[PDB]
Amino acid sequence: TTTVGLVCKDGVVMATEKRATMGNFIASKAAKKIYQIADRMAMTTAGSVGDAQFLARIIKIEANLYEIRRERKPTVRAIATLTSNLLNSYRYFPYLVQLLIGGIDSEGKSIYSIDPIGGAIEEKDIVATGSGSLTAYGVLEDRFTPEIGVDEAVELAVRAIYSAMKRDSASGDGIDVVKITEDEFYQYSPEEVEQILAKFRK
Amino acid sequence: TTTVGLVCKDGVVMATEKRATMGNFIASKAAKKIYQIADRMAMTTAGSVGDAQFLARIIKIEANLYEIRRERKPTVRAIATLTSNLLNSYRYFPYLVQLLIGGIDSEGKSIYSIDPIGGAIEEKDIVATGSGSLTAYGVLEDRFTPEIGVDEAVELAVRAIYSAMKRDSASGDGIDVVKITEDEFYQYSPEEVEQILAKFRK
Amino acid sequence: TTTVGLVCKDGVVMATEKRATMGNFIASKAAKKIYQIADRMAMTTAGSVGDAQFLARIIKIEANLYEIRRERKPTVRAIATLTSNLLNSYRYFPYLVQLLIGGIDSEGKSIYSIDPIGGAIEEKDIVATGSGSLTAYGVLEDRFTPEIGVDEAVELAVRAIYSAMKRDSASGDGIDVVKITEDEFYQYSPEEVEQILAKFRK
Amino acid sequence: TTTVGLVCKDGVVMATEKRATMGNFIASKAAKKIYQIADRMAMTTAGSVGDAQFLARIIKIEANLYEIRRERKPTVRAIATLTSNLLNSYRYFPYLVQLLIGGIDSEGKSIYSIDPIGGAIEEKDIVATGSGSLTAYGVLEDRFTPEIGVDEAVELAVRAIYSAMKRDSASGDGIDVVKITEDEFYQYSPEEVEQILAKFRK
Amino acid sequence: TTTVGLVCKDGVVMATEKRATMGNFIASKAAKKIYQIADRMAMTTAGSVGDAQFLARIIKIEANLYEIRRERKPTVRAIATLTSNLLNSYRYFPYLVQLLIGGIDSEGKSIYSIDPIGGAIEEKDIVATGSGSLTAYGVLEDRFTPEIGVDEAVELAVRAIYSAMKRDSASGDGIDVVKITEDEFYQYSPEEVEQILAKFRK
Amino acid sequence: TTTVGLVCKDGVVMATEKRATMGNFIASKAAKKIYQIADRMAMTTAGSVGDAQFLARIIKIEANLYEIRRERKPTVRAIATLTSNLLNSYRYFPYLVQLLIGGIDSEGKSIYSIDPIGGAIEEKDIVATGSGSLTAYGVLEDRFTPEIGVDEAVELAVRAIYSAMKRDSASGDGIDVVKITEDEFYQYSPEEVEQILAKFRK
Amino acid sequence: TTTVGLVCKDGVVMATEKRATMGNFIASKAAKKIYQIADRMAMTTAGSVGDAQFLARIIKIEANLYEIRRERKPTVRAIATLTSNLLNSYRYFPYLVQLLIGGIDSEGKSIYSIDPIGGAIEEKDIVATGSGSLTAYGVLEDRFTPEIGVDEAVELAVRAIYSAMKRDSASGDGIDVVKITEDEFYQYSPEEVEQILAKFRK
Amino acid sequence: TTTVGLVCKDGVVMATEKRATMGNFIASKAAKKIYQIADRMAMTTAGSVGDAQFLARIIKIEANLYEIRRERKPTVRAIATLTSNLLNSYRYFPYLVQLLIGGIDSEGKSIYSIDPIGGAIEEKDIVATGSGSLTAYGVLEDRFTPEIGVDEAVELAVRAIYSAMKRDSASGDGIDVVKITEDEFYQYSPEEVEQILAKFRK
Numbered sequence A, B, C, D, E, F, G, H: 001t002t003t004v005g006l007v008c009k010d011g012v013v014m015a016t017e018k019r020a021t022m023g024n025f026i027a028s029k030a031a032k033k034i035y036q037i038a039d040r041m042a043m044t045t046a047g048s049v050g051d052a053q054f055l056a057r058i059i060k061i062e063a064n065l066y067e068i069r070r071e072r073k074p075t076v077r078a079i080a081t082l083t084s085n086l087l088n089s090y091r092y093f094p095y096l097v098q099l100l101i102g103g104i105d106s107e108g109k110s111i112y113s114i115d116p117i118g119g120a121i122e123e124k125d126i127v128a129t130g131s132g133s134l135t136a137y138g139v140l141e142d143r144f145t146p147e148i149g150v151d152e153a154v155e156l157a158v159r160a161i162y163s164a165m166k167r168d169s170a171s172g173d174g175i176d177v178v179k180i181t182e183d184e185f186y187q188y189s190p191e192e193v194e195q196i197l198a199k200f201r202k
């Protein structure tokens, strides 16, 4: 697993690959690791499949209910705080999961990286997660500039996850990307991604 | 143990062998590892006999009650989510079991592979489970094509579990197969299977 | 790692992929895992890189010296026995390596699979080795027939290692093949292999 | 693994199956587990493949040299004593092996069961060895009589090892049998065995 | 301990020996290990004496109460499912016991082998239990035929447990047998058993 | 295992049963546990079969060599001291064995019980050894009197070991007895023993 | 500790010695280890002093209350079942105690040996308990006959416990005996016992 | 620690940073991690300072002596093999070091990555080492092309190690680079490097 997230001048981008493993056994070539929380909020999951999936459901349901009840969409901060508390409450038998929760809201654009114990770091630009994160961080920290726009940012994301798949046998099989602009919450589809990494080597 | 599941263009196929072991002791040459959940939904069980049998009962009862109460059949997704949550709630003393739940429903055709912690991967084509899964995956990934039809898919299934029995001492003794077409939920009977693997070597 | 070996009616075939890992870290995309011992004898190495490489040198040197001194080429049996004894002598701090030594000699055609403790099995037809062996065994035990000829046997070999790369994150990156006929000891070169697996999917 | 040995009124019979395992992985369907030591002496090996194979070579070589030097064939007692001492000398890091050494000699007919620590029991009638021995002992202790003759004893042997293959997943794949009469040291060949167990069920 | 159970064409047979041990200490030469659950249902117990005894009481009481309340006798399946659930509920500190619950009921004839975790295998013919089971399985799998009748089946049972006592120091001291025909639920008494094994050697 | 030894007014008596076990597995019904060291000296062995057997050989050879060289038979004290030193020298990885070395010599009649560390107690009357010793001691300390004669002493011995077989699953299968009078070193043979315990119950 | 119990043709006899230890420290030369439960029921306690004493009080109180409430004396079976259940309920932190509960009741004469986990064996003749039981079993199994009468049975009991005191340093200091005939529940007093063992050696 | 090595079309480049740590303690801001073995051969060291430094001396001395004695410069292959063997000989208490040995020689251009156990991978293009390697690998695998020339390769190298220092607290403080062309073995000096990374951000 490897997922990235970058805050651009015009939005937010998040991406992940599709591999799920249990040791060296490749259990899945198409695991879902990117979830939609709100209209302009996404979440990427790295860690225990069962734990992540479980938590994802909770997160969604609570974001929904929040809106339906208060007639206001929850801010990423609210969802991040919510999730942190939940995670930390289980600090003595934590959910082995590394979350990325971000998007656009009344407060602006932001991304939060949250660990098993509910430690949340507010990402003001670049972030990678998963067994491949360190390689991904390589290119991200090389080519990123705050003025980057979401459109080239998705290329950068695919670029980084592509590198990581080359040195992390736990990553790979393909890549999902998501752009969160404001006028939209877009998900690229295999075709479009396959054509974006085509300008690379595969 | 070894169980396979493949989503064909015209349905779903699931199969397992009949061996149950405790170390090298072959406790059973005819263990049941394939269960019917709904009219067009089956489940294969790998892992702890006691745990799998216990969970099967729960799964069935809940599927039934769902329908009887809501007058709608539960979707595989619903049963899979249900089962995931249950499994994950016991994550600190998990039910050592690998489940395969699939069939046809209003949403389409699909199979879910669920682990002890409730981690569920949506199988869009091929899947194997059990101590023999890795060998079975060999032939499955070799001869499978999305256009494969349930009828040749059952042959493929028998084919894979047959290879597996040749390298996994924990597998063997025979094989059950199930076809879920729509016009039917068919179970082949020893005779028919014995005649399908007859075109192989035994 | 995943290596296969098959004894055909007209010779011997051995193949391996090129991946070397340390955890999930892919350390090499082109590791050498196939060595030439004598004119009609090869060896594939699975296990500890350092241990395998060390043993490989010893094996070659002793095979050479044997011939140079006795003016006779050593039989695979002689090299296999030699290696077994060496391996077993270190049984209390064994060389973590799974070896495949085979080819053609005055006694005929044969392959030996040898473990860390010097346990050698005489492969009279099919054999796989490495973290991907179980998947490879799948297709090997499915498509193999004693009448198979070395020429289609190299296809089969590529076929099996290809399946294995699909479910073993520790395998992959490419594949070496070697044909040991009698009139020759041939090594296919990337181009030729790339063209043989081209009739598959990649 | 499972091997039996019985002392008849007219000779000695010893048999084993052909399976070699590493966990549930069936590494070999045709492992050799019966060795000829002298003209009227055989040995069956249960345990670590590498250890047994290593010891077998030593046993043979020493039996040979004994005869070549003293122009007398070594008695089973001599080989058994020899092997005991060797085994026990390594008592603190023993060779994980269970040996059966027997045949006919100037002293009569006998079989010795020897363990890792060189503890040798003189079998005056029936004996089984390996992961399947306990099941084999079932039929052996049921149908054996001191007056049994080698010819029906080989049937009995196949009978016992056949039962064992039914409950010991570590046993199976076939069976070697050896008759040691005096006028001969005979090894039945697949055909003959296949026809002897044919009077059973397979 | 060693207990057997066989489903004949005309009924069910179950037998056990009478030894109870704590290490090598023979604590009892006449332990009871065969209980009557219903009119045509018996149960054999292997494992912890205290755990087995405790469970036996619960089983009986619940079978009784079932009939008294529903005016129907409980089927072996119902008792087996009941016992499974109870056993599995205590899966994290299980009752160290191996149970055999069978007899005749409206559904036919059947036997269930149930383990500490509530894993139940439906015995359609032969089954052994206890420290001597593996030896007992030897003769059972040797002499059994589906057409066997309860009358020769009790001989077979005595035969098997007799062999087992010969290689399992934890078994012995005597043997109880029970025939469940339909016209009866018979328990042989020492005299009758002593006379049945008399046709053997003791 | 269980062996006894008693010093009578007219000689020495030593006896043992014939069982050899590995867990609950009865490996032998006729193990030898009584050795002749000199003309009027015997030794019983309890413990590790391999260790006991190895030691027995050394003991014999050294007793022989002692006499051949010094033209005097070695006293039991000399053999006991010899054995003590050998045992104690290996005190940090001792030979798991309990030895009984006694008979008649120029110094009189005596028995020595020696443990793994070479601790030797001079038995002036009664002594038992093995897993059944404690039960054997029961009858020995009950019926023994210093005036007992070797002839009734052998009955006493059989008596004790017979009780022991009744509560020690590790003992049994038969019993060897040896009388060391002076005019003789007699070994009773199955027949004679079978007739001596016949005056008991079996 | 060492306690015996024997069922005679005319009643029941139970005896124990008086030693209580903590390591090699003799804490008591007159510990009470025999309790009266009902008019014709006694109980001997081996094990943890505090645990036994605690359980003894519970046993008595409940036997009493049983009778006072139902105006019937409780059968030994009832008390034994009662105690079993209590013991087993604490199976995960058991009361370290070995109990002997027996006497005469409407059902006949019987003795029950119960362990920490509530495993109760119904003693139909002979039984010993405690650190000395194995030696005591020696004489008991030697001199016992079903026709023995309580009067000689108390001699036998003293006899056995006397032997045990000779080889079990944890036993000794004296011996209590109790006869349960029907016309009486008698306790011999030091004088009478001292005079019964006087016909032995002390 | 983080070191990179790349084989260009016109030579070889190798670089490392200057940090040495013991936990979080920064022990050194200018540790030497690049050594000259021969005229056109360099070595980078990651791992234990003491181990690396020790091994470095041995390597140099042996390379020297080799040339002085044979009047030929040693090939990188020879030094790599030499080093492998040394490392492997100490496989049971290995030198905790990751080595990079490469340069230009009669055989061409190459780099070897060697581990504690003497496992050597032949780097045909890109390679990183140390706690920062995974990040470095990111940019290396992103910007590298076989046609890259040593001159831009040194930029790339500085680029990669610069990224790594950003996410590996164990790396940093500065960076050495070395070009091995043929007409030279050049080492850039702080000034030149400081000016090369100046085109980046620091």
Ligand SMILES: CCCC[C@@H](C=O)NC(=O)[C@H](CC(C)C)NC(=O)[C@H](CC(C)C)NC(C)=O
Pocket (backbone or CB within 6 Å): A001, A002, A019, A020, A021, A022, A023, A027, A031, A032, A033, A045, A046, A047, A048, A049, A050, A052, A096, A130, A131, B115, B119, B120, B121
């Ligand atoms: C659907 C999201 C999965 C994300 C993906 C990325 O890391 N994670 C995984 O694949 C994790 C990695 C392990 C080390 C926790 N795999 C797992 O959690 C697997 C999941 C099974 C469903 C195959 N199980 C175990 C015991 O590891």
Ligand SMILES: CCCC[C@@H](C=O)NC(=O)[C@H](CC(C)C)NC(=O)[C@H](CC(C)C)NC(C)=O
Pocket (backbone or CB within 6 Å): B001, B002, B019, B020, B021, B022, B023, B027, B031, B032, B033, B045, B046, B047, B048, B049, B050, B052, B053, B096, B130, B131, E115, E119, E120, E121
């Ligand atoms: C009916 C379900 C059986 C499926 C089958 C496939 O894997 N599983 C099994 O056979 C499992 C495998 C082990 C490794 C958990 N066996 C078991 O669970 C056995 C079952 C006894 C009834 C013999 N028990 C133990 C303690 O292992």
Ligand SMILES: CCCC[C@@H](C=O)NC(=O)[C@H](CC(C)C)NC(=O)[C@H](CC(C)C)NC(C)=O
Pocket (backbone or CB within 6 Å): C001, C002, C019, C020, C021, C022, C023, C027, C031, C032, C033, C045, C046, C047, C048, C049, C050, C052, C096, C130, C131, C170, H114, H115, H117, H119, H120, H121
């Ligand atoms: C190169 C020939 C060996 C086969 C190859 C394929 O798997 N083996 C390997 O890659 C083995 C696998 C492990 C599980 C022993 N890897 C290793 O031996 C590597 C070696 C490093 C130098 C990269 N890892 C460790 C921790 O020693």
Ligand SMILES: CCCC[C@@H](C=O)NC(=O)[C@H](CC(C)C)NC(=O)[C@H](CC(C)C)NC(C)=O
Pocket (backbone or CB within 6 Å): C115, C119, C120, C121, D001, D002, D019, D020, D021, D022, D023, D027, D031, D032, D033, D045, D046, D047, D048, D049, D050, D052, D130, D131
């Ligand atoms: C070739 C005949 C050997 C006898 C045969 C019978 O038991 N033994 C075996 O098959 C033993 C069994 C294990 C439990 C020690 N297997 C082994 O020794 C295997 C051998 C490898 C070559 C696959 N290794 C390991 C670590 O298990």
Ligand SMILES: CCCC[C@@H](C=O)NC(=O)[C@H](CC(C)C)NC(=O)[C@H](CC(C)C)NC(C)=O
Pocket (backbone or CB within 6 Å): E001, E002, E019, E020, E021, E022, E023, E027, E031, E032, E033, E045, E046, E047, E048, E049, E050, E052, E096, E130, E131, E170, G114, G115, G119, G120, G121
């Ligand atoms: C009473 C019928 C049960 C079957 C019988 C046969 O094996 N079981 C037994 O004999 C079991 C075996 C152990 C290994 C759990 N014995 C026991 O449970 C004994 C029972 C005491 C009353 C002596 N306890 C202990 C701690 O060992």
Ligand SMILES: CCCC[C@@H](C=O)NC(=O)[C@H](CC(C)C)NC(=O)[C@H](CC(C)C)NC(C)=O
Pocket (backbone or CB within 6 Å): D114, D115, D119, D120, D121, F001, F002, F019, F020, F021, F022, F023, F027, F031, F032, F033, F045, F046, F047, F048, F049, F050, F052, F096, F130, F131, F170
């Ligand atoms: C052969 C005469 C020795 C006395 C005999 C009696 O107890 N000894 C034995 O039976 C010993 C007992 C164990 C606990 C050391 N058995 C053993 O030493 C067995 C011997 C094998 C040949 C089955 N080995 C193991 C590892 O248990």
Ligand SMILES: CCCC[C@@H](C=O)NC(=O)[C@H](CC(C)C)NC(=O)[C@H](CC(C)C)NC(C)=O
Pocket (backbone or CB within 6 Å): G001, G002, G019, G020, G021, G022, G023, G027, G031, G032, G033, G045, G046, G047, G048, G049, G050, G052, G130, G131
């Ligand atoms: C009073 C009668 C109790 C029975 C008697 C028989 O064994 N038990 C005893 O004497 C037990 C024996 C040990 C091995 C549990 N002794 C004990 O329970 C002692 C009792 C103290 C009051 C001195 N405590 C300990 C920690 O040992």
Ligand SMILES: CCCC[C@@H](C=O)NC(=O)[C@H](CC(C)C)NC(=O)[C@H](CC(C)C)NC(C)=O
Pocket (backbone or CB within 6 Å): H001, H002, H019, H020, H021, H022, H023, H027, H031, H032, H033, H045, H046, H047, H048, H049, H050, H052, H053, H096, H130, H131, H170
């Ligand atoms: C000459 C190569 C030094 C490279 C440098 C970069 O990682 N290595 C190091 O700093 C290694 C790292 C540890 C994890 C083995 N450090 C060490 O070996 C330090 C050395 C002390 C002189 C500070 N000691 C300990 C106990 O760690």
